[PDB]
Structure 1
Amino acid sequence: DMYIERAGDITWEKDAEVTGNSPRLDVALDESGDFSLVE
């Protein structure tokens, strides 16, 4: 049986850690909601 626990407020944080790149990927989405890469 699944249960929920509060973890925080939803707010923008000034000066948060900035990481990650911005890739442009060609993808396909199937009936089961699964993405796959089209290359």
Structure 2
Amino acid sequence: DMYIERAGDITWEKDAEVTGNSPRLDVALDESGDFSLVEE
């Protein structure tokens, strides 16, 4: 069995670290809800 415990408020933080790129990917979503990359 599972339970939940509080982790914080949902707020935008000013001066948060910015990182990561913004890739454009061709993906496929199957009926199980899993994403996979599309072969070239």
Question: With structure 2 as the length reference, what TM-score do the two structures score?
Answer: 0.92
Structure 2: 5+ residue stretches without partners:
none
Q: What value does the CA root-mean-square deviation take over the aligned residues?
A: 0.6
Give 4+ residue runs of structure 1 displaced > 4 Å after superposition. Answer: none
Structure 1: 5+ residue stretches without partners:
none
Number of residue pairs matched by the alignment: 39
Q: Partners in 2 of 1:36 and 1:7 — Cα distance? A: 31
Percent identical residues: 100
Question: With structure 1 as the length reference, what TM-score do the two structures score?
Answer: 0.94
